Design a protein around this ligand. Structure first.
Ligand SMILES: Nc1ncnc2c1ncn2[C@@H]1O[C@H](COP(=O)(O)OP(=O)(O)OP(=O)(O)O)[C@@H](O)[C@H]1O
Lengths: 597, 181, 221, 104, 553
């Protein structure tokens, strides 16, 4: 109402805490750079009046438009015409009833949720300012459609003998807003008896869209209003969420503040990063020092050279594990999932290997095909994780050969044939032929036939089962510490708070130090690896005279040059050194003699 | 050898040249001031104006044995005539006390419990003037001719803020005009 | 010659330096009129506090105002002589070239005092003994003296001589020499029209269009 | 440029004390050439910092990371661990730049 | 002997110069009321324009190695609550030097067992003897007044018997427990009113210290609930509301409850410490979640706008609590909830009362960070003390909320072993007390600092706050985290269920002098408060054996 409005233009130009005067001092600061938006922060709003909140929190749609018009008028005042309407962004943190209140009282009430968005759609257009002409008398009006009860808020009237529906929609003086129809999925840990999860639907506005990629946790605040589409028995309807503010966690397109890198620059000046991360990554893993160094260089990566001709160099690494059960080859892999920016966990069976890359289907509108799914289209930049590279006998091998070593797939199916980009990084952990007897026989028979998959991977660990009767009792001392008593929650808060790094700071950290520094190895260091390699092939061919066959080829040699590029991304030095590169071969030379044994 | 802020002034010493200008007080107390710029008095009579320099009077309010009087333009019933000569004139701003913005900030920290209703009224009638001035300056510099501008009523604060870019952003174009021939 | 008059001139002759492109004559004469004063008033409050010590086998005001005042005035000349050092460092090769051959200006007493030309000749010496033995061992026989012959002329000067500076016009109204219609102001560019100042309007200009009118302090910065 | 243990150029950049110690003759020269400039002025004006202008007389100051008895001149302040101070402004400038008193 | 206005002007002239004529004060950090009294004294010295020096001290054995080794011309030392019982002059000797002495201290003790040498024998110990106790141990007027001057062997023997009669009246004295009768907020605020400085910040500050003693006594602040009602009315800032002013820091009165941290947090969370109120009734773990789900469950509480159903929608729902809490009058008789309360505001930013405000200060004093490890541990509590004294002004806001979020988990943490030891059933009623030795459960590390231990006992004194018509004795606990069996053992006080007719103080500190004199094999009184001592493991088992026979109540 007008009276209500008189009670908001007189409130969002003098609200302040103690001499900062903030809401004029950001609205001006948001009219210079074109954004046209507010962040009210409703829990901070309550200082005026509980009544004016309660005329909002009990009734909808009317309140949003009245508030928007008041803000537009104040914005107009802070100038002296090209002036668009604004949009609001609200945010609070009460608690998130996950997906349980459905119809009881939470219809058109303010609500806060948490989910994982999986499926985006293409953009669209709805109008917000029109100009309408009649057939009979050339009448001219203008009707604005701001907020919604989707369309059919108000229809085109009959007034201007005169025939009905005399009006049309011209396209010469109009404005448009875009919706999304992105689909929210439940975070799959908090509905536990035995059931599958469900899903909802949500739309939004332009100045808060395209802020999400699928594969992230998000929190979300909004309305629970109801539409009705006539494409089921009783006159029913359907639920959806009009959303207001995605004040989620980080993106997990590199814009952020300066103090986030201030401590990072204050940490990177300390030259103790490489030895301290091996403890600070996995706080519940007994040592395993050689493997732990390989995981931090996998997550960072190398570079990508598009050198001045057609071809390119595949600048990344892909580790591979195998070993006996009970030796941490599997439980380590859930640990790399949370720390990655983008991580996918399809670790089982291969899951119908043609469906790993891309899939088509008949689509219900227009009876057509296009491309929808895939386990590799969403995992660019990050890392996938799979297992069991023995009993996928059908088609796992034919589905990763083109997927690796060029990362340029193209689907030859009934519709398109397009080379969509990929920058993926694979990771796997398998089993040999029941472990023990394989390492007590002729040392082949690990992958039963093919060496051609092994030559695409580069870095291979082989763990074993010793009987060291001394350190094992410390391991038996180690597991009873974590498993009950939970003193490592209090030990790794009394050794971490000055020395170690918590689990969530690295997710902040890795996305910054990758996306800034473009490094290059030292040019005079090229004498080192060339002098290194020539005896390794001699160390190879000293074994084949013993009637021994299989695997070392040159692709691992151009992988070590990516390995020495990896820690240069860690130290963020644009040039490499020789104390740098000798520790890198120190990691690989502990996996050169593995081919001998 | 600072090598940090040399071309300009920091905002910690532009206040230093305005604190050495005098205003009027209401004394209370009864040689005492031989400061070489002093004007010491005898037993001082209350209810009498006297032009005293500001920085000792700020120190005199710490021991709290005096009281300040506001200057003649520091009520909300007086700045209303200022905000109409500008809204009819997009040409320039007319009438300014020339040191106003740095004056009120000293006059609100520890000088809040002196005047009748400064709070919830005067800061509304100040921050509007902090931007209507600077709305005018954004139309101004787009009209940049060669080596000729016209600023009439500019504060010491804004002239310390337009400064460190407007010099070299026209000096760099002074090359291509002059060194063309 | 009142001490209030003998201080407001100092403040005006400090701020004008702080955005200057080139050096100004160091007014040593007025400094010596107050170089005694900073010693005297420290000595005045030296013993007069000791009489307040010996009265106690009341007043806390008149000591505190004296102590903070003269050090605040001492703070101004603390910055005022460092920026001379911050300016005389870069300009060294130019000013010696103004001082080597005989010309219209000498590095005089009213230009520079005792210690900074004692600083300048010594520091420019030890600067030359860094480039010589550690770098210019393999310097061939055309690059001996560090000054530009031709090619890249940057070992010579600071010719920043049209840097812009905000001006405040503060002409003393005595008519006296009146030329213009509102007041007496003049200008002359190198190329453009002679549109000028009026009374106190803040303007922007180059330097040699205003270098003449600052020898007589009729217009401030 | 000389506040406390000036000639101690140690505990500072010792790995690059083959860089700078080989140029210390310049560093020492600047050092000695700034000592007489502290005395070439016929009246003692401080040149060792204090570049920010003063504000008032009384400043709340805390202390940490320090011990021992310092400040033999201008009255001994009895500097012991984690102690508040509330003093005159003009005596702390030779310790803030020293980095012994911490917060204003 | 010292009227309150006199010592202020007396300490004025003794250190007022603009030089290093420094006066220094010492303060115990472990008491919350000890802190807030000192803060208001410092700021009036700022507008008295004098230099100062503020040094905290926590160790009663550490008092020597701060004062008694680093002194130059410090004429005016000052304490707050240090020497009520143990004589510091025998602890720190001062020879008669320069009747009109040269170095002068005061003291601001708050304890009932005094020591007559400090008040009488005031060559240097100028204590605050004004109208604190006008009946200051009325037997003193002939007891030691005949001890100062000390055929006739039938007369002197009677005179020595009179001295022996004076001996027992000085033997019954120095044989009582201790407390604080009047908090130090009461003295200095009354002293400032004799000077007459009108600021509501002082009126906000002084009420915090008496609010801290709402857990160690009942009625001393019931003696002062009148003496604040006049002051909130005499210092009335306004008759109208005079709305929309962001300033002016107004004061009001609304009835508040023992469901603490409510207006900060979630009326939900009462879910834990309403069972504390049912531990104040009868139960802690068995039936409560079966019991509690009618009264505190007027809904299965909606979390749609719940952040403003304990902020805003409670306009109707806590006014229904305004009409529930007179029909929950009879429902369980649970009337330790209605309390008069007091509140402050800011102009904006939500109200904050003073009940929950002392809760944040206690928890924030805890967290916020041979025999050589103790120095790096004794220096921690003094450091994290310092990030709380600054939290009383609006110059900091955004760490006051950090104690709020550290309040409502440490209480969940301290409960997480209290429910364990209660169902361990290791509380052994021997003859008089009950002994509990927490040998090692989980989460042992949060019991080095003693301030958590009195709260742990404050929850543990309430599990035995059933009827218990016989054997109303508090307990003694035991724990260990570090080397050489430190074992910061402590005692408690018994508690009345609000029906003091017999003001029980303590019986332990009398016996604590005995065992610190008899065994003499690693026993310590180095920790400050007499209610807490240390003991060795092989001596804590014969500790009680001398205690089970020595009946000293
Ligand atoms: N090196 C190690 N350090 C600490 N804990 C370990 C280590 N190796 C295994 N564990 C423990 O083993 C427990 C269960 O592991 P799990 O049963 O998943 O092993 P697994 O999958 O059979 O081993 P593998 O991955 O070799 O097959 C985990 O809780 C983990 O703590």
């Amino acid at each position: 109402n007008t009276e209500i409005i008189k009670s908001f233009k007189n409130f969002i130009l003098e609200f302040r805490l103690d001499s900062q005067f903030i809401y004029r001092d950001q609205l001006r600061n948001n009219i210079l750079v074109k954004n046209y938006s507010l962040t009210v922060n409703m829990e901070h709003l309550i200082g005026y009046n509980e009544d004016i909140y309660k005329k909002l929190s009990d009734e909808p749609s009317d309140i949003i438009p009245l508030f928007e018009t008041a803000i537009t008028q104040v914005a107009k005042r802070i100038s002296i015409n090209s002036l668009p309407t604004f949009q609001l962004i609200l945010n609070s943190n009460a608690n998130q009833i996950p997906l349980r209140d459905l119809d009881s009282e939470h219809v058109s009430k303010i609500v806060r949720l948490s989910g994982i968005i999986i499926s985006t759609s293409v953009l669209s257009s709805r109008a917000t300012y029109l100009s309408i002409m009649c057939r009979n008398c050339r009448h001219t009006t203008s009707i604005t459609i701001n907020n919604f009860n989707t369309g059919n808020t108000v229809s085109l009237p009959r007034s201007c003998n005169c025939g009905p529906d005399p009006y049309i929609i011209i396209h010469e003086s109009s404005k448009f807003i875009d919706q999304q129809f992105l689909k929210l999925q439940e975070i799959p840990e908090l509905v536990p008896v035995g059931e599958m999860p469900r899903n909802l639907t949500m739309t939004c506005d332009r100045y808060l869209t395209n802020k999400v990629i699928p594969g992230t946790r998000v929190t979300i605040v909004g309305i629970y209003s109801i539409y009705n589409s006539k494409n089921s028995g009783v006159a029913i309807r359907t639920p959806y969420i009009k959303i207001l503010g995605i004040q989620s966690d980080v993106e997990t397109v590199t814009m952020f503040t300066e103090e986030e890198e201030e401590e990072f620059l204050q940490l990177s000046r300390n030259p103790k990063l490489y030895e301290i991360l091996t403890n600070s990554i996995a706080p519940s893993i007994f040592g395993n020092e050689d493997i732990k160094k390989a995981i931090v260089c996998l997550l960072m990566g190398g570079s990508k050279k598009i050198l001045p001709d057609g071809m390119r160099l595949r600048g990344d690494i892909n580790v591979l594990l195998l070993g006996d059960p009970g030796t941490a080859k599997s439980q380590l892999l859930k640990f790399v999932e949370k720390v990655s920016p983008i991580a996918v966990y399809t670790s089982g069976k291969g899951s119908s290997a043609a469906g790993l890359t891309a899939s088509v289907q008949r689509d219900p509108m227009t009876r057509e095909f296009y491309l929808e799914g895939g386990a590799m289209v969403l995992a660019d930049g990050g890392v996938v994780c799979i297992d069991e590279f023995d009993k996928m006998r059908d088609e796992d091998r034919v589905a990763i050969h083109e997927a690796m070593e060029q990362q340029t797939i193209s689907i030859a199916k009934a519709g398109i044939t397009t080379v969509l980009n990929s920058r993926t990084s694979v990771l796997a952990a398998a089993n040999p032929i029941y472990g023990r007897y394989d390492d007590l026989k002729s040392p082949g028979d690990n992958i039963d036939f093919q060496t051609t998959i092994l030559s695409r991977f580069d870095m291979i660990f082989i763990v074993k089962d010793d009987h060291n009767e001394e350190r094992d009792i410390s391991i038996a001392n180690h597991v009873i510490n974590i498993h009950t008593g939970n003193a490592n929650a209090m030990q790794n808060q009394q050794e971490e708070n000055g020395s170690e790094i918590s689990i969530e700071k690295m997710k902040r950290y890795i996305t910054y130090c990758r996306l800034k520094c473009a490094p290059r190895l030292s040019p005079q260091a090229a004498e080192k690896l060339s002098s290194n390699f020539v005896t390794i092939r001699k160390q190879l061919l000293i074994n084949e005279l013993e009637s021994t066959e299989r695997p070392i080829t040159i692709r691992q040699l151009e992988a070590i040059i990516r390995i020495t590029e990896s820690l240069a991304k860690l130290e963020l030095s644009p040039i490499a050194q020789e104390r740098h590169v000798d520790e890198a071969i120190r990691l690989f030379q502990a996996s050169t003699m593995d081919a001998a044994s | 050898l600072p090598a940090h802020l040399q071309q300009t002034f920091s905002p910690e010493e532009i206040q230093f040249i305005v604190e050495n200008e005098p205003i009027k007080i209401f004394p209370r107390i009864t040689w005492q001031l031989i400061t070489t710029d002093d004007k010491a008095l005898n037993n001082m009579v209350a209810m009498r104006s006297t032009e005293v320099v500001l920085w000792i009077a700020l120190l005199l309010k710490q021991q709290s044995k005096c009281s300040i009087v506001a200057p003649q333009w520091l009520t909300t019933k007086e700045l209303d005539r200022k905000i109409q000569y500008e809204k009819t004139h997009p040409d320039r701003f007319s009438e300014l006390p020339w040191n106003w913005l740095v004056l009120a900030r000293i006059l609100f920290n520890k000088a809040k419990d002196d005047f009748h209703d400064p709070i919830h009224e005067l800061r509304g009638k100040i921050q509007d003037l902090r931007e209507i001035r600077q709305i005018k300056v954004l139309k101004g510099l787009k009209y940049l001719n060669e080596s000729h501008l016209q600023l009439d009523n500019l504060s010491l604060l804004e002239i310390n803020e337009l400064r460190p870019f407007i010099t070299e952003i026209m000096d760099k174009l002074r090359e291509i005009h002059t060194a063309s021939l | 010659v009142s001490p209030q008059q003998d201080f407001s001139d100092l403040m005006k002759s400090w701020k004008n330096e702080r955005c200057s492109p080139e050096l100004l004559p160091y007014p040593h004469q007025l400094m010596k009129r107050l170089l005694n004063r900073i010693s005297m008033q420290s000595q005045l409050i030296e013993n007069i506090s000791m009489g307040f010590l010996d009265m106690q086998n009341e007043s806390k005001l008149p000591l505190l105002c004296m102590e903070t005042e003269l050090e605040r005035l001492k703070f101004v000349i603390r910055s005022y002589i460092r920026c001379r050092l911050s300016k005389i460092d870069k300009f060294s090769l130019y000013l010696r070239q103004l001082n080597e051959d005989e010309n219209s200006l000498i590095s005089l007493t009213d230009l520079l005092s005792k210690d900074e030309i004692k600083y300048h000749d010594t520091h420019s010496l030890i600067w030359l003994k860094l480039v010589n033995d550690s770098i210019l061992k393999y310097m061939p026989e055309e690059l001996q003296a560090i000054n530009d012959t031709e090619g890249s002329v940057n070992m010579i000067d600071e010719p920043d001589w049209n840097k812009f500076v905000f001006i405040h016009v503060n002409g003393p109204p005595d008519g006296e020499n009146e030329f213009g219609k509102p007041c007496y102001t003049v200008t002359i560019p190198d190329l453009k029209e002679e549109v000028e100042l009026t009374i106190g309007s803040i303007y922007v200009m180059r330097y040699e269009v205003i270098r003449d009118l600052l020898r007589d302090d009729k217009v401030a910065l | 440029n000389g506040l406390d243990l000036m000639s101690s150029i140690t505990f500072s950049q010792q790995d690059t004390n083959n860089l700078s110690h080989q140029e210390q003759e310049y560093l020492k020269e600047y050092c000695d050439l700034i000592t007489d400039l502290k005395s070439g002025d016929l009246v003692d004006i401080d040149l060792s910092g204090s570049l920010v202008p003063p504000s008032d007389v009384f400043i709340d100051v805390r202390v940490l990371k320090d011990a021992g008895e310092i400040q033999t001149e201008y009255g001994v302040f009895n500097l012991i661990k984690d102690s508040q101070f509330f003093v005159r402004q003009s005596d702390v400038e030779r310790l803030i730049q020293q980095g012994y008193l911490q917060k204003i | 002997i010292s009227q309150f206005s006199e010592a202020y002007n007396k300490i004025l002239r003794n250190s007022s110069s603009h030089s290093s004529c420094q006066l220094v004060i010492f303060v115990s950090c472990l008491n919350i009321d000890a802190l807030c009294a000192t803060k208001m004294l410092s700021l009036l010295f700022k507008k008295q324009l004098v230099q100062s020096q503020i040094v905290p001290i926590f160790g009663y054995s550490e008092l020597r190695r701060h004062y008694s080794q680093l002194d130059d011309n410090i004429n005016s030392l000052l304490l707050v609550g240090f020497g009520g019982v143990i004589d510091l002059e025998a602890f720190l000797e001062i020879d008669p030097q320069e009747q009109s002495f040269r170095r002068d201290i005061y003291v601001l003790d708050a304890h009932r067992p005094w020591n007559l040498d400090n008040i009488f024998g005031s060559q240097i110990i100028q204590c605050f003897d004004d109208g604190t106790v006008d009946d200051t141990l009325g037997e003193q007027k002939e007891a030691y007044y005949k001890l100062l001057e000390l055929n006739d062997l039938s007369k002197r023997k009677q005179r020595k018997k009179q001295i022996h009669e004076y001996e027992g009246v000085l033997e019954e004295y120095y044989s009582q427990g201790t407390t604080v009768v009047n908090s130090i907020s009461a003295q200095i605020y009354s002293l400032l009113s004799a000077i007459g400085e009108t600021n509501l910040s002082n009126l906000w500050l002084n009420i915090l210290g008496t609010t801290s003693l709402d857990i160690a006594y009942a009625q001393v602040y019931n003696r002062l609930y009148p003496l604040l009602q006049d002051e909130v009315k005499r210092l009335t800032p306004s008759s109208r509301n005079s709305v929309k002013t962001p300033d002016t820091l107004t004061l009001n009165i609304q009835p508040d409850y023992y469901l603490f941290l409510l207006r900060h947090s979630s009326l939900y969370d009462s879910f834990y410490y309403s069972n504390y109120v049912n531990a104040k009734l009868s139960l802690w773990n068995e039936n409560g979640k079966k019991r509690l789900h009618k009264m505190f469950a007027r809904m299965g509480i909606p979390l749609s706008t719940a952040q403003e159903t304990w902020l805003y929608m409670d306009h109707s729902i806590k006014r229904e609590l305004g009409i529930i809490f007179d029909k929950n009058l009879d429902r369980y008789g649970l009337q330790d909830i209605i309390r008069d309360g007091f509140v402050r505001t800011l102009g904006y930013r939500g109200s904050i009362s003073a009940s929950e405000f002392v809760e944040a200060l206690t928890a924030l004093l805890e967290v916020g960070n041979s025999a050589q490890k103790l120095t790096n541990l004794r220096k921690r509590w003094v450091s994290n003390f310092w990030l709380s004294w600054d939290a009383l002004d609006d110059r900091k806001v955004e760490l006051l909320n950090r104690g709020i979020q550290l309040a409502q988990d440490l209480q969940r943490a301290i409960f997480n072993t209290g429910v364990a030891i209660l169902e361990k059933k290791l509380i052994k009623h021997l003859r008089i007390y009950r002994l509990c030795v927490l040998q090692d459960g989980p989460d042992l590390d949060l019991y080095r600092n003693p301030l958590t231990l009195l709260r742990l006992g404050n929850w543990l004194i309430e599990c035995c706050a059933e009827s218990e018509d016989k054997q109303l004795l508090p307990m003694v606990l035991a724990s260990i985290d570090e080397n050489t069996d430190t074992y910061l053992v402590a005692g408690l006080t018994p508690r009345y269920p609000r029906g003091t007719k017999k003001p029980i103080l303590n019986n332990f500190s009398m016996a604590f002098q005995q065992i610190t004199a008899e065994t003499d094999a690693k026993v310590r009184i180095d920790n400050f408060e007499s209610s807490i001592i240390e003991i060795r493991r092989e001596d804590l088992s014969p500790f009680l054996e001398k205690l089970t026979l020595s009946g000293l109540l």
